[PDB]
Symmetry: C3
Subunit: 644 residues, 3 copies
C-alpha cells in the first residue's frame, strides 16, 4: 500500500480500483511485475491483460516467455505483430497457425515444444509475405548482368531498402522445365534515380536472366516478411502417432528474406515408415531470399524435409539430418496445370547433410533450378536413388551414397550433364552413377558393390576407382535407344579385376558404337581376355581407341635378343582374333625399343601372337609373340613392354 500483490491471475484481473501508479505484482506460474494504464493496448493475456478500468502491462526488457501466457491464442496474438522476440519455454498446444512477422525471433528452450492439434492436421508456423498486387513494365530491356532496371518515372515508388519482384514470359532455363515455368527474381533496391522521365533502380544483386520487353518484362513491389529467426524449433514429439496427432507443413515460408532456421527438431506429419503424403513438407521455402536451414533434424515426414521452390535465391542447407522422409532436400517445380507459374531456385547450397531411409531420393531437384551444389552430403539406404538430379548441371563435391535401392547418383530423362567430383558410391543395388540419360562428368569418383559402377552414354570418366561390380565397372548404355550417344572419354581409371564383373560393357542392344569411346591410361589389370562385355550386337563392332592401358602385371616387360632378325618371347601378350558378333578384334600394344646397336639394325615388328590354350585353365605365361626385324641379320637386343 501503494503495493498490490496477488497469488493468482483471476485475482489480479478481478481487482476493481487499480491506480495508474500502483506497484502491481503477480505470484505464481506466470508471475511478475505489471503496470496499470488506460491506454488502449492489445490484450494477449501474457504481456497485456484487461482489468477493471484498463490494462495491465508486464514490465520487462529482453524477450518474452511462453510461460507468461494464459493460452495458445495469446501466443498467436503476440506473434502477429512484427519486432517480437519470444522464448518458448513451455509445452504449447496449438489449435491454429502461428504467423511470424518481420524482425521476429522465436526461440525454444530445451523444454519448449509446439504440439500440433490432434483434431485438425494443419500448418504450424507461417512466415508469409505476398506477391505484388500490381506490376509495371520495364521501360527497356535489362540483360543478364544488369545492375539497374528502368521504369517510367512515376510508374511505381521504389523505396531504398525494400524489395522488387521481376518477371517475364521467358521460360526458366536451369533444366528441361517441362511445366514451362516462367522466370522471376527478387531483388533489393539500393539505389534510385529519376531523369528524363525514366526511373533507374539500382539493385543489390545483378539479374540472372534476360528481361526483355518482347517477353513482357514487368516488375512490382512484393510485401516481404524479413529477418526472422527460428532458434531450435521443436515441432511435435515422439509418440505423436499413438495420439494420432499430425500436421501438414511444419514451417511454411513464402516471400521471406533473411529467414534463418537454426537446429531444432520436426517429427511426424506421417506415421512411422508410412507412405507419403503430397505437400507435407517439414520446411518449405517458396520465393525466399537469403534464407537458410542449419542443423535441423527431421523424423517421419510425409513429403520433403526441406523444400525449396519459386525464385528462391541464395539458399543454404547445412548440417541437417533427415530420417524417414520422401526427400531430405528437394528443389521443386510448379505444376502449371492450373495456370502460369514463375520461379526456379537459383544458387542453392547443400552442405554436410545426412539422409537416412528416404522413401525416394535422398537429395533431389526437379527439372528447373540453376547453380545447384551439393557438398559433402551423404545418403544411406534410400528406396530409390541416393541423389537425383533433374535439372541441368548439378554439381556434387565429395558426396556419398550407401546402399541405395537403385542408383547411388542419378540424373533422369532429358537431363544434361551432372558433375560428380570425388564422389563415392558403396553397395547401391543397381549402379553407383547413372547418367545414361544425357551424359555426365564423372571425375575421380568411386563405385563399389553395384551391378555396374557407372552407367553412362557420353561424357567423361576421369580417374577414380571401381570395384566389386557384378556386371562391369563402366557400362556404356542409354536410357532409351532414342537418346543420343556422344563422345565418351575414359582416362586414368582404376577398373581392376577382382573376380566379379568386367571392365567395360558396351550395350549394342540400344545402339552403342564403341568407336565413340576412347580408353587411355587405365588400369584394367587381371581381366585377361575378358576386359570387355558386349551384348546386342549383330555384327562385330570396331573397338574403341585404346592407348597405353594396363591389362597384366606379370611378364609385361623384358628384354629379348634377336637371332637372324627374330626372337620368340614369352609374355602376357593377348588379343582376340575371332569374329563373334558380341566381341572385339584387338591385340596388345607392344612397345619395342632397341638397347644394342649392331650394324644389322632393322625395323622392328611384332608378329605371331600365340596364346596358350591349356585345359581346363589356360596359362597366360605361355603366351608368346615374335619380334621380327626388317633386316634378317639383326641381332639387336630389344626391350619390350606389353600394354593394351
Amino acid at each position: 500500500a501503494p503495493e498490490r500483490v496477488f497469488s493468482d491471475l483471476a485475482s489480479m484481473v478481478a481487482y476493481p480500483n487499480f491506480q495508474v501508479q500502483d506497484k502491481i505484482t503477480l505470484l505464481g506460474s506466470a508471475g511478475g511485475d505489471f503496470t496499470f494504464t488506460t491506454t488502449a493496448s492489445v490484450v494477449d493475456n501474457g504481456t497485456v491483460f484487461a482489468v477493471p478500468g484498463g490494462y495491465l502491462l508486464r514490465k520487462f526488457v529482453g524477450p518474452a516467455y511462453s510461460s507468461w501466457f494464459s493460452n495458445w491464442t495469446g501466443i498467436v496474438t503476440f506473434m502477429s505483430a512484427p519486432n517480437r522476440h519470444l522464448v518458448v519455454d513451455t509445452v504449447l498446444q496449438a489449435t491454429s497457425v502461428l504467423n511470424i512477422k518481420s524482425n521476429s525471433t522465436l526461440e525454444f528452450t530445451d523444454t519448449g515444444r509446439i504440439l500440433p492439434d490432434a483434431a485438425v492436421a494443419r500448418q504450424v508456423l507461417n512466415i508469409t509475405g505476398s506477391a505484388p498486387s500490381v506490376f509495371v513494365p520495364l521501360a527497356a530491356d535489362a540483360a543478364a548482368g544488369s545492375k539497374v532496371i528502368t521504369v517510367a518515372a512515376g510508374a511505381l515508388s521504389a523505396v531504398k531498402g525494400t524489395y522488387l519482384y521481376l518477371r517475364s514470359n521467358k521460360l526458366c532455363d536451369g533444366g528441361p522445365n517441362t511445366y514451362g515455368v516462367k522466370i522471376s527474381q527478387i531483388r533489393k533496391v539500393v539505389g534510385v534515380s529519376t531523369s528524363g522521365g525514366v526511373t533507374s533502380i539500382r539493385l543489390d544483386k545483378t539479374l540472372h536472366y534476360n528481361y526483355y520487353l518482347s517477353d513482357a518484362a514487368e516488375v512490382g513491389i512484393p510485401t516481404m516478411v524479413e529477418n526472422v529467426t527460428l532458434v531450435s524449433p521443436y515441432i511435435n514429439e515422439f509418440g505423436y502417432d499413438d495420439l494420432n496427432r499430425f500436421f501438414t507443413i511444419g514451417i511454411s515460408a513464402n516471400f521471406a528474406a533473411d529467414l534463418h532456421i537454426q537446429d531444432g527438431v520436426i517429427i511426424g506429419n506421417k506415421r512411422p515408415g508410412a507412405s507419403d503424403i503430397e505437400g507435407r513438407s517439414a520446411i518449405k521455402f517458396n520465393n525466399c531470399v537469403d534464407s537458410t536451414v542449419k542443423g535441423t533434424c527431421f523424423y517421419n515426414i510425409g513429403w520433403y524435409g526441406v523444400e525449396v521452390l519459386g525464385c528462391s535465391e541464395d539458399t543454404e542447407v547445412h548440417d541437417i539430418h533427415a530420417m524417414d522422409v520422401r526427400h531430405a532436400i528437394s528443389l521443386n517445380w510448379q505444376s502449371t496445370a492450373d495456370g502460369d507459374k514463375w520461379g526456379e531456385p537459383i544458387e542453392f547450397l547443400g552442405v554436410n547433410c545426412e539422409a537416412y531411409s528416404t522413401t525416394q531420393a535422398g537429395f533431389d531437384t526437379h527439372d528447373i533450378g540453376k547453380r545447384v551444389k551439393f557438398v559433402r552430403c551423404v545418403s544411406y539406404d534410400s528406396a530409390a536413388a541416393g541423389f537425383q538430379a533433374r535439372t541441368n548441371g548439378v554439381e556434387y563435391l565429395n558426396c556419398r551414397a550407401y546402399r541405395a535401392a537403385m542408383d547411388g547418383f542419378a540424373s533422369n530423362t532429358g537431363v544434361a550433364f551432372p558433375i560428380y567430383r570425388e564422389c563415392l558410391a558403396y553397395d547401391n543395388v543397381r549402379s553407383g552413377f547413372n547418367c545414361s540419360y544425357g551424359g555426365g562428368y564423372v571425375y575421380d569418383c568411386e563405385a563399389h558393390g553395384s551391378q555396374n559402377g557407372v552407367r553412362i552414354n557420353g561424357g567423361r570418366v576421369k580417374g577414380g576407382r571401381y570395384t566389386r561390380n557384378s556386371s562391369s565397372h563402366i557400362f556404356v548404355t542409354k536410357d532409351v535407344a532414342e537418346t543420343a550417344q556422344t563422345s565418351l572419354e575414359i582416362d586414368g581409371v582404376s577398373m581392376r579385376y577382382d573376380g566379379t564383373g568386367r571392365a567395360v560393357y558396351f550395350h549394342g542392344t540400344v545402339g552403342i558404337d564403341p568407336t565413340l569411346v576412347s580408353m587411355s591410361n587405365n588400369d584394367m589389370t587381371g581381366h585377361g581376355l575378358f576386359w570387355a562385355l558386349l551384348s546386342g550386337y549383330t555384327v562385330q563392332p570396331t573397338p574403341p581407341r585404346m592407348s597405353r592401358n594396363l591389362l597384366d602385371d606379370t611378364g609385361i616387360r623384358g628384354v629379348a635378343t634377336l637371332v637372324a632378325g627374330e626372337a620368340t618371347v614369352n609374355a602376357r601378350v593377348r588379343g582376340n582374333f575371332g569374329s563373334v558378333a558380341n566381341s572385339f578384334k584387338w591385340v596388345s600394344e607392344v612397345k619395342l625399343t632397341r638397347l644394342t646397336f649392331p650394324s644389322s639394325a632393322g625395323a622392328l615388328t611384332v608378329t605371331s601372337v600365340a596364346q596358350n590354350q591349356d585345359v581346363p585353365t589356360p596359362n597366360p605365361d605361355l603366351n608368346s609373340f615374335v619380334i621380327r626385324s626388317s633386316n634378317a641379320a639383326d641381332v639387336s637386343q630389344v626391350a619390350w613392354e606389353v600394354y593394351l
Copy 2:
C-alpha cells in the same frame, strides 16, 4: 518504506535523502532497481547516475541494454571499460567513435542500429590495441619453427597468457613485396623459464620466419584488445544517402586478438553506385590474430569490404555478402613512402563468400601475404577481375567467377603461380584464367564464354573442360616479352571445337617457343586442321610434343588388309606439310597393330597421307593414308587408330 519509488530519471537524480540501505526503484522507458553508494563511480546515465551525496547504481545480472542509457555519450563511456556486455535494443545516434575493450560483447537486437553522425564522417567502432612502446633484442637467432625465443634475463617481463610482437629487418616473403615491408608476428606467451642470464619464452604457435640477430630481431609487449564479440552489428541504414549520412571505416581493429564479428549489416560509406574513396573499408583488421568475420552483409562501400593487413594471423572470413564495394575482401600491403612498415598476413581463409558488382576485383590480395586460401567463393559482374592474386601461391578451391569485365581469375606483374583447383569461370570477357604474368597451375578448371579460356606462360593445365572461347581455349602468351616462358604441360584437357575459337594459341609476337609445351591426352575433337592458332612468327616454329590426343571421332579406327605389302585406308588422318610462318608442320599419329600373322609379316609404316581438297568445303572422310610393309609379300590384317 524503507523504499523510494520515482516516475522518471530527473526526479530520481535530484532527491537528496539517499542512504546506503534504501531499496530504490524507477518507472519509465529505462526503469529498474538501484542501490545508492558513495564509493567512486563512473557516470554513464545508464548503470551509474551521479546524485547528491554519491551515485545510484543500477543493479542487474546479465547484459545491459542501450534502452537504459540517456544518450550516445554514456553508451561510449560504458563500453570504454573492459568486461562489458551491452545489448543494443534501440536506434543509437552516434556523434563520436565507440571504442570496445577486452572481454566485451556488443549485441544487436533486430531493432538495434548505430547510425553514423550526419555532421562528420568519422569511424564507428574501434577495437584498438597498441604496438609496443619499447623492444629488446633476441638473445639468439630463432629459426622458423621455433617454439621458444630467448632474451637476456630481466630484459622484459613476459607474463604467461599475454602477447608479444616480434620483428626483424627481413623482408616479407609472401609475394613481390614492392614496398619492402618487413616481418613481424604476434605470439602468446604460454611458457617462461630463466637460466644462466637467458630467459626462454615459450610461444603458443611457432615462428613462421627466420628471426636473425643480423637482421635486428627484437621483441616487445604490445597491448592487445582481446576477446571481443560483435553480434549482428547494423551500422547505418538504407536511405542514408538521402540524408548525406556516412562514415569512413565501419569497424576498425588494430592489435586485436579473438575478435569475432557475427552476421550484421554495414551500409553506405559511399553513395550507391558512386566512385571509391581511399581507405573507407567497412571492416579493417590490422595486426589481428585469430579474428573472424562470419555472415555479414556489406552494401555500398567506398573501399574494401573486409581489409586485412599487417601481421594478421589466422583470420577467417565466412559467408559474407558484398554488393557494390571496391573489393569484397582484400589483403593489403602498407606503403613505405613515409617510413618502415611491418607485417604481412599469414594464414587467411575466405570461404563461401559472395561478391556482387565490385568496382575492382571481387577478391584480392596485394603483393605480400603467406598461405592465402579461397574456398568456394563466388564473384559476379566485377568491373575488373573476379579474383586477383598479387602475392605468391594463392590457392583457390572450387571458386566461381561470373561475367567479370576482364578475367575471372588473374595474377599480376611478377606474381608467381597461383593454384586453381576445380574453379569455374563463366562469361568473363577477356579470359577465364589469366596467369601469364609468371606461371600458373590450373587444375581440373573450366572456363566458358571468354576470348581465351586460359592465358598462361608456364605451368600446367591438367584436366578441366573449356567451351565457347572466341579466340582459343588455351592461350600460351606472356604479360610482356621480358617475362620468361617456362615449361607448360597440357594434359587431359577437354578443348573440343564448338564453332568458336581454336584449341591452343601460340603467341610468337612475345617470344613463345612451342616446343616448351607438351600436349598429352587431350580432347581436341572437331578442330580438324585448325587446332592451333599461331601469330607473330617470322619463321615456322617447331611444334610442341604431342602424345595421343584426339582430333576426330569418325573414321579414326579400323582394320585394313594388306595385299602385296600395301593397303590404302580411308580415314580422318590429318596434317600440315606447308611451311607458312604462323603454322606447324605436323601429322597424325597412326597406331598400327597386326591381327593375322602370315609368314610374310614385315615392319609396318604409314606413308602417302592424302587429304581431300573438295570445294567449297573439303570432306575429311575422303582423306587417306597407306600402310606399307617392309616385306613386299605381306598380307597381314592390320588394325589402325588415329590420334594427334
Copy 3:
C-alpha cells in the same frame, strides 16, 4: 516489506509466511517467495530457513553469481532441465555433473578453476550402459531399418535409445585389441505381432548383427541435449599455482552434446611430457555430438578423444597448441576384458594443431568412415597426420615441418586416401604409406628426404620438389610386407638440384616391373631419374610411357639420305649392367612428313651419348633413324620421350 541487507540475515528470520515480499540486497541480490514444500537446497535458487525454504524468483537462466559456493552449483546442475550462466570465477573442489536438457553458458568473465589440492575431472556428462540385454529374435543385416526381439522382452519407448552389440569384431581397421561391435540407435517406431516386436530405428545398422554372434540389445541410460557454450576451464598461470585437472570434459553415453568455442588449458606443465588419459575433451559412446571452435593449450593427452561407438561426431575449427594429439580416435584395451565400440562417421574440419608431442591428428586401429577436411598440422614431434585404421580420407590437408612424416599410415594399415594434400618441410617424408599402400591424389610434398614413401597403390597427379633423396621412394616398412601394383601417372617430379625422381628399394624386395610410370614430368634428371640400391642382379625396369625427361633437343625434323639420318637430340639411355641400375632408352616417336615412293619402315638405332669432361654435353647426344628401304629420303618428324 521483508528486505534484508545481506545473506545471513535472510536465513535467520523465523517469520516468513506463505505469501510475502522478500528482497535481498548485495552481491547475491534477488527477490524470493516462501514455502514449506520440499525443495532441494543449493544456496543459489533454493534456501533453507527456519520454517521451510526461500525460492528465488526468475525466468530465463540462473547465474553463478547467485550461489554461495561451488557446492550449490553442483547441486543445482545435478538435475536435468537446467540453464546456468557462469558469470563469475568458480573454484571447483568436486566434479560437476551435467544432466539432460541442460546448458552451461560462460560469460567472457566466467571461469571454472580446477582444485589445486587434487587433480580430478572437471565436467562430466554421463549416462550408463544397459543393465540388462535381450537377444535379437532374428539376424539383422547391415542396412536394417528394424530389429526384432521377443514380445514382452524389453519395453522400447519411442524417442529413447537402444544399445546393440554382438561378438563380431569391429572391422574399420586392424583392431588388434579385438574390440567388438556396438551401436546406439533411437527408437522411432514400434510394432508387435505374432510374439515378435519390431523396433524401427532412426538410422540403419552398419554391421551385421547375427544370432550366431549373440547379437543382443539393451536400453542404455543416455544424457541428452547438453550444450556447453564457451567453457573456460583453468587459466594461464595455472602452472605457477600447480593447479591441474585430469580430464576436462568427459562424456559417456551422451546424445546431442554440443561444445561451442571456449578455452581449456593446463592439465600439464607447459612443454612438459605427456600423462596418460589426460584428454581435454573425451567422447565415449556419444552420438550426434560435436566440438566447434574450442581452443586447447598445454594438454597432457589428447585434445579431443573419441572412443567407443561414437557415431556422427564432428569437430570444427579447433586450435590445439602443446597437446599429444589434437584429435584422436581411440581403441579400447581388452587386457582386462571385453570391449565394445569403434567410432563410425567422424568429421574433422578446418582444425589447426601446433607443436604436438605426437601426431597432430590421429586414429588408432579401429574406426569407420573417418574424414579430415582442410585440417593443418604445424611442427609435430612425430607425424602431422597418422592413420591407423583403414581408408582414412584426407581432403586438402596440410602438414608443415613434422619431425617425421607429414602424413603416415602404420603397421598393417590399409590404403589411406590423400586428396590434394600439401606437405611442406617434413623431415623424413611428405607421405608415408609404405605399410599397406596408399592412394595419393594430386598431392604435393616439398622439402623432405622423400616426397612419397609407398609400396603399392597410386600416385596420380600432384607436384614434388626439393626432396634430397627422391620424390617417390618405392619401399616397404619391412620386407615381410607385400608389394603391390603401383601406378605413377601425371606426376610432376622435376629435377631441381636435389634428389632423383624415383627410388626403388631393392634392399626390401621391391620389384620395379610392378610399377608403371605414365605421362610424368621428370624434366632435368638426365641419366639419373632413377635411384636403385640393394639389388644384386640388374632388375627389369618399370613399364614407362611418354614421360618427359628433357625440355631441349626433344623435337625436330630430320631428312633421310639413302635410308638414314643422324640426329642430334637429347636421346638418352643406359646399356650397362650394374646391379643397381636399369637398362633403358628414350622413347622416340617417329612420324613421316614427306612421302617419297621409296618410303620404308622406320627405326631408331645407334644411340650415342656425348662423353665430354668434366661434364658431358647432352646436346651432342645423337641417334640414327633408319628405313628398311635403302632408297628412302623421307622427312621424318621426331619427338623424344621416356
